[PDB]
A = this chain, B = another copy of it.
């Protein structure tokens, strides 16, 4: 019987050819301002171009390389400087190098025995993240997304309060109440439903005109929950909301939590990266008082999806106690290394991706200093965009940004001066969808839009890509004016 792994003359030839296409088309053309951010195709046309159906007979190297080219060609270039659609943008070359190594090594982040380098590396990465929060002791894990990080935090808080629920379930326990801002309630609600608490267990707290949770309303809602028979157990503050980029007042919220004996979770998936900035880290003042912090380096630090940590001040092996399986004890296992290093008991996953190397390698190249410089420059470019938009006709700022989320309407010539008509906001709301379609079909830029509060669709420009220059901000304004002129 022959090896079915592949002709090894073919393997080197294949990977060399593929990496050539990746360098030319994904890494170089995909980050070049002279190329398109996206090549729009209607779903049915793209199906035709991709010939997707999986079938009986295989294909040749030539056929495979043509498919690789097509996949890259028609994919959105998220590393492109004019990709502003998400809370990630850019292609850090060291993070990419780390990703490529990780994929080549294909292991599970599980035991020192199958992942010795990564068991040690993850520990260091989590220790460093904890240091930036303000903790020199604690624990933590990587999770497959911040949404799941948030769920872990809720599960851990529930377990600390009611450890028997791990065996008996929560059905006979009192009603549990958790609290979060109106500006960040989606994964919290999804998580509450998944964990068996129900979305009704989530009490949504008022946010002020800057998008910040109101501590007086938090206190009010805690009292109302108690009056309805519930047991408050957790408050989830948000340090960097997804739309406005607002930062909750952590010191005041920590005070409320302390008064009521509640677990404080900080959802810093987006804003946590600001801890690298000496100039801007004050936005998270009080975060060291948290019981848990979610932080996604795959967002502002550009580590690559997914890179999402849950950080704890805990030193009681709460993760292992809460998530661990019951061990058998009939026969001694004589493991020849310190199995305290292993993380299988800390997670509800079994197999787990290595997410630490892409972050670690980039952090080795950049240092704290390089990552700080990038954060600070993003803040500068966001403020530059705001200042420049005020000088042009048509741009209406939603609010002054606290972070790098710049939110605004584009008012086209046909609506300029018509602010006091009865259907103005209704008409203005239809503008961003049309402009988005045009920029996408042109391939020149992508900006996200959404409605929020009592107002209709406005743009959210996220200023995150380390490649950005002032000229890119100028381009964005110039292009909106050009695409919007006939609206």
Contact = CB atoms under 8 A, between A and B. Distances in A.
Contacts of A169: 170, 175, 192, 196-198, 200-201
30 contacts: A5-B91, A5-B467, A8-B28, A15-B23, A22-B101, A27-B104, A43-B116, A46-B116, A52-B121, A54-B125, A68-B97, A75-B105, A75-B117, A77-B105, A78-B106, A79-B106, A86-B108, A99-B103, A100-B103, A102-B103, A113-B440, A144-B144, A145-B351, A171-B172, A171-B175, A185-B350, A296-B351, A306-B351, A332-B429, A333-B433
Interface stretch (A219-227, A358-366, A479-487): A358-366
B304 A465 contact: no
B466 A11 contact: no
Contacts of A201: 169
A18 B71 contact: no
Contact of A334 (B103, B125, B434): B434
Interface string A261-302: 000000000000000000000000000000000001010000
Nearest to A168: B198
A2 B26 CA distance: 22
Interface stretch (A57-65, A206-214, A246-254, A400-408): A57-65
Given A124-B53, A333-B457, A364-B67, A381 B1 contact: yes
A68 B94 CA distance: 10
A112 interface: yes
A145 to B, nearest CB: 5
A430 to B, nearest CB: 7
A336 B101 contact: no
A368 B335 CA distance: 41
Most buried by B among A16, A59, A169, A173: A169
Interface residues on A, range: 35 or more
A377 B5 CA distance: 12
Given A55-B367, A57-B367, 17 more contacts: A1-B381, A3-B468, A3-B469, A11-B27, A11-B93, A12-B23, A12-B27, A12-B28, A53-B128, A58-B365, A58-B369, A106-B304, A147-B351, A298-B351, A306-B351, A330-B451, A334-B433
Nearest to A352: B145
Nearest to A185: B350
Contact of A54 (B46, B298, B368): B368
Contacts of A46: 116-117, 120
Contacts of A137: none
Nearest to A384: B1
A134 to B, nearest CB: 16
A328 to B, nearest CB: 7
Interface string A153-176: 001000000000111111111010
B467 A357 contact: no
